[PDB]
Structure formats: structure tokens, C-alpha cells
Design a protein around this ligand. Sequence first.
Ligand SMILES: Nc1ncnc2c1ncn2[C@@H]1O[C@H](COP(=O)(O)OP(=O)(O)O)[C@@H](O)[C@H]1O
Ligand SMILES: [Mg+2]
Length: 433
Amino acid sequence: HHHHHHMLKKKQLTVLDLHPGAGKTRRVLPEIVREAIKTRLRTVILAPTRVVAAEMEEALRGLPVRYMTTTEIVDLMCHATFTSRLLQPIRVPNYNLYIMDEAHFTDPSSIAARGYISTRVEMGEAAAIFMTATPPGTRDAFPDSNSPIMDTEVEVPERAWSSGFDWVTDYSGKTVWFVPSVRNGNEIAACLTKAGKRVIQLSRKTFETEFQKTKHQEWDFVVTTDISEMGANFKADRVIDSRRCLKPVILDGERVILAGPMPVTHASAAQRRGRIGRNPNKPGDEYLYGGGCAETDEDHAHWLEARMLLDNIYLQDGLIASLYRPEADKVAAIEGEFKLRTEQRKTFVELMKRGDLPVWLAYQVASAGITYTDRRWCFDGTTNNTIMEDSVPAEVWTRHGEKRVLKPRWMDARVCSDHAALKSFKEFAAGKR
Ligand SMILES: Nc1ncnc2c1ncn2[C@@H]1O[C@H](COP(=O)(O)OP(=O)(O)O)[C@@H](O)[C@H]1O
Ligand SMILES: [Mg+2]
């Protein structure tokens, strides 16, 4: 009940960079929405995840918002839903105001959304507010917090241990642990469970369902990938941060491998640490971090994947949206080089949305003129593209009634990097998803 005016203006992009936990999502977003409704500004609110969309729903109770997730001149949807609708024939309104929460998110749909939105603003067609404690390029891993944090550099294990890490388990509070990969998290979770700890595991595939268990069940550790690192409210006392992640890298323009683990950005480290120190009544939450940060993330496939999406979004005849200016030097590409014709673009969209294929892999298949249900390409690659299950070639019973080795024409290590990913890709290859 302490509303502040936002004298909003078209032709302007505002970066709202209040520190983690300052109340961007819970306090400032509702103020902006009130001003938007009053002034009849057609507005979209963009959430990075269904979890943040749920936290926005709570904060926006009483305000007329159309939720396009799970009279009303404000719409709310996920970053990925916005970008997917921009690729499709579907009528996406020409919003007067774009509000992007967690505007640092580096998933390709989020990078593409920022490029589209910043281009609309540069063209003088709209206003935008990018809400993030860690705008692109930030070199500050230790921003302000609601409560003092104890920051300690330690050796953080990335494997099961039988000695040398007593501080991990001799701790009676709640810990969020950022691991380099789903498989490393599996191994750490099993070590913690053997030591008598109650562990919840989060990844992109499982976040939207498993996060609810953090609100509803008792737990000692959340073992999570980077999906959890922003806009997640955990009731935690300690973060353990590997400060490292596997990175998908395009090798020789022909395949995607998972490289590293490699250091995270200062933005990622700040958001991970920012999960604690959020309660002003609870000083001395701990952030225990396992190494340094780096801004050398140009090898990450997500920058080129963002160009693949942007090249396929219509703005105006002959105009392709640029990446948001501070991100524009992340990728060597020719503007438009990934533009697909109408039917190939529909296949591209369906492979990402219904197929759950990575952007790069969906683009290879769609650009080859393959239709969505034609899975021959899953079996006709070179022998070095053979996918392995328990150190033996993975086998699929195909729609054509043959037992065939999984051997895709284009290899993207993201489809087979963990048991759940491979299970899903095997079903996809069988025409059974
Ligand atoms: N369910 C809740 N009830 C009360 N306080 C909450 C709840 N969820 C989050 N908070 C607190 O509200 C504050 C603002 O959080 P939030 O708006 O999510 O911050 P930001 O978006 O700037 O990171 C933080 O101190 C956070 O701990
Ligand atoms: Mg927030």
C-alpha cells in the first residue's frame, strides 16, 4: 500500500537492476501493472519459468491479467511461449509495453525475446522494462542482499566423497547446491542420501513439478542445475556453488558436444548466491563457492540458437531483429542466414515445442526439408554419431518394425547427456513421444 508512479514512455528501454531480493517481482511489478491498466497500455509480462509465473500471479491478485501459462489488457506468459508464438502464424499483439522479468536468462528463447523487444523499442514502437539484478556484462558476483552473507571460497566436490568435506554434512540448516550437470547432481544426491540427508533434485525438465516439493516436503538439500539460480525463493540458509557448468558447444559447425565443466558468468554466480541472504531477520546465511567466474561464454551454443530463432521472427519486410546491444557481440553470424521458408519454419517450431529438441538440432532437421514425423534421420548418421546406453549402443524398435542402433544424422549431446534426456530421445526416435 505504498504505490510509486512509473512515468512510463514509449521509445524507452529501462533496466530495473535492484539487487537480488529487493522486490522487483513482488513489489515493483504490481506498481507497473497498476499504471499500465490505468493508462490502457497493452502490456505483456514475461516470466522465465512457470514457477516465476506462479509467484507473479500471487503478487498480481486483484489486477486484471490474462494468464497464458499452465478488460484484461495485460497478458502474462513465459519467455519461451512469447518467442514460440512469434515464430508461428498466431496473432501476437503489438504490445505498447514489454515487461521482462529475469531479463538476464540466457536460454535461447529469452535472448531472442530481448532482441525482438529491444528492436521494437529502437524502432520507436514500444517501451520495455528489463528487470534483473544482473544485466548482461555484469562483473559483480557479490551484489547487495537484504541480510549480510558469509562468502567463503572452498573446494566443492563434483563426485561422491568418503572424506575431506565434513563441512557439507556437519550442517543442520537447509542447503541449495548448484551442480555442473544432471549426472553430477545424481552422484552427489546419492552420496548425501547415504549420509542420511533428504535431497530434492531440480533440472529444466523437472523444475516446473519438482520445485513444488521444496514448498510442501521437509528437505536438507536441493541439488539443482542453473535453472533454479534466479527468481526461485527457497527457504534456505546456505548455498553451495560449484561455479561451473557443462556448456553445449558447436564443433566444426556440424555437431554439439557438452564441454567443460567451465566457469559460470558473474551474473550466474550473483543469482546463485542471491538465493540466500533474502530474509532481513536472518543474517549470516552462507555462500560457499568452488572457484572463479568468467565472461568468455561465446562458445555457448545458445547465442547462435538465439539468431536461429530471431531470423524466423517477422518484424517488418526485410527487417531482422538484432540481439539486444550488450549481447550483440556474442556471436559471429550473418543476419538472416537461418531464415526458413513457411513450411520448414512450421517444422522447426514443432520439433522444438512438441519434439522438445534443442534449437540447433531442430534447425538442422527443418532446414534439411524433413517433416516432423519422419524419424529416418535418427538412424542414418555416421557410426561416430552412435548414442551409448550403459557403455553399449542404444537400440530402438522403429515405426518401420526394425531394431536399429540410435545413430542420428546430426549429433547434439543434449539429447543423450542424462538418463531422462536419452529416454525422451529414444521415444522420439521410435515415433512414440
Ligand atoms: N511467499 C513470500 N512471503 C513473504 N515474503 C516472501 C515470499 N516470497 C518471497 N519473499 C521475500 O520477498 C522479498 C522480495 O522478493 P522478490 O520480489 O522475489 O525479489 P526480487 O524479484 O527483487 O529478486 C524477498 O525478501 C523474498 O525473500
Ligand atoms: Mg524476481
